[PDB]
Design a protein around this ligand. Structure first.
Ligand SMILES: CCCCCCCC/C=C/CCCCCCCC(=O)OC[C@@H](O)CO
Ligand SMILES: CCCCCCCC/C=C/CCCCCCCC(=O)OC[C@@H](O)CO
Ligand SMILES: CCCCCCCC/C=C/CCCCCCCC(=O)OC[C@@H](O)CO
Ligand SMILES: CCCCCCCC/C=C/CCCCCCCC(=O)OC[C@@H](O)CO
Ligand SMILES: CCCCCCCC/C=C\CCCCCCCC(=O)OC[C@@H](O)CO
Ligand SMILES: CCCCCCCC/C=C\CCCCCCCC(=O)OC[C@@H](O)CO
Ligand SMILES: CCCCCCCC/C=C\CCCCCCCC(=O)OC[C@@H](O)CO
Ligand SMILES: CCCCCCCC/C=C\CCCCCCCC(=O)OC[C@@H](O)CO
Ligand SMILES: [Ca+2]
Ligand SMILES: [Ca+2]
Ligand SMILES: [Ca+2]
Ligand SMILES: [Ca+2]
Ligand SMILES: [Ca+2]
Ligand SMILES: [Cl-]
Lengths: 25, 25, 25, 25
């Protein structure tokens, strides 16, 4: 388990990469 | 909970994205 | 130890930087 | 505490931002 602020940051970062990929595609 | 260095890195990363968004807006 | 979603995000981020470096090289 | 792979990724990410800032400055 992780600090909630770390889990969030991890969610934010994954979604960021997903969005970037979909925008480039 | 997380290593303090991970919590910080998570803070740094969130603030980085926030600043980037506000700069682009 | 970390939340599995954090470990993944960490893997994703490391691989992302690796790929970016190899693409620029 | 965190998974060692997460602590590393956090180190990698902080150093990455540091280097980027110093390169832009
Ligand atoms: C492109 C659309 C805009 C995206 C904006 C992205 C910025 C999002 C802002 C960050 C939200 C982070 C939420 C963070 C939620 C943490 C919850 C907390 O209460 O626990 C604190 C712990 O440390 C105590 O153990
Ligand atoms: C755009 C403005 C400039 C932004 C610069 C961003 C770079 C910031 C530098 C990084 C600060 C990280 C602070 C890290 C704080 C960690 C605290 C520590 O004592 O615990 C170590 C643990 O691992 C032991 O369990
Ligand atoms: C360039 C090629 C495309 C790369 C796409 C990158 C996006 C990858 C998507 C993200 C996958 C994340 C997998 C996440 C796996 C988490 C496993 C889970 O079951 O546990 C949840 C815990 O929180 C419960 O404690
Ligand atoms: C610009 C110069 C080049 C920079 C390249 C950056 C890429 C660095 C590669 C990644 C190194 C990650 C090291 C990862 C070290 C993890 C240690 C491990 O043994 O534990 C595994 C745990 O999950 C078990 O609990
Ligand atoms: C160009 C913009 C790209 C932005 C991509 C990122 C967008 C992310 C948007 C918002 C997602 C917020 C998700 C925030 C999810 C927070 C999860 C949490 O805090 O954990 C709760 C704890 O009690 C359990 O660990
Ligand atoms: C283009 C530049 C963009 C830079 C965006 C990032 C700027 C971040 C600035 C500095 C914020 C430093 C915050 C550092 C916060 C450290 C928190 C910590 O180490 O935890 C203490 C432990 O005892 C509890 O877990
Ligand atoms: C321009 C695209 C660049 C994309 C770079 C990133 C690509 C990453 C690709 C996919 C890797 C997915 C790895 C996902 C690995 C998930 C590990 C996990 O969830 O932990 C399981 C737990 O039970 C134990 O902690
Ligand atoms: C444009 C390139 C920018 C690259 C910036 C990032 C460069 C990073 C370079 C390498 C640093 C590797 C640091 C790797 C440090 C690993 C720490 C670790 O695995 O923890 C050991 C555990 O037993 C305790 O938690
Ligand atoms: Ca906390
Ligand atoms: Ca430590
Ligand atoms: Ca933990
Ligand atoms: Ca969980
Ligand atoms: Ca492990
Ligand atoms: Cl963690």
């Amino acid at each position: 388990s992780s600090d909630p602020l770390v889990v969030a940051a991890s969610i934010i970062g994954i979604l960021h990469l997903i969005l970037w990929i979909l925008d480039r595609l």
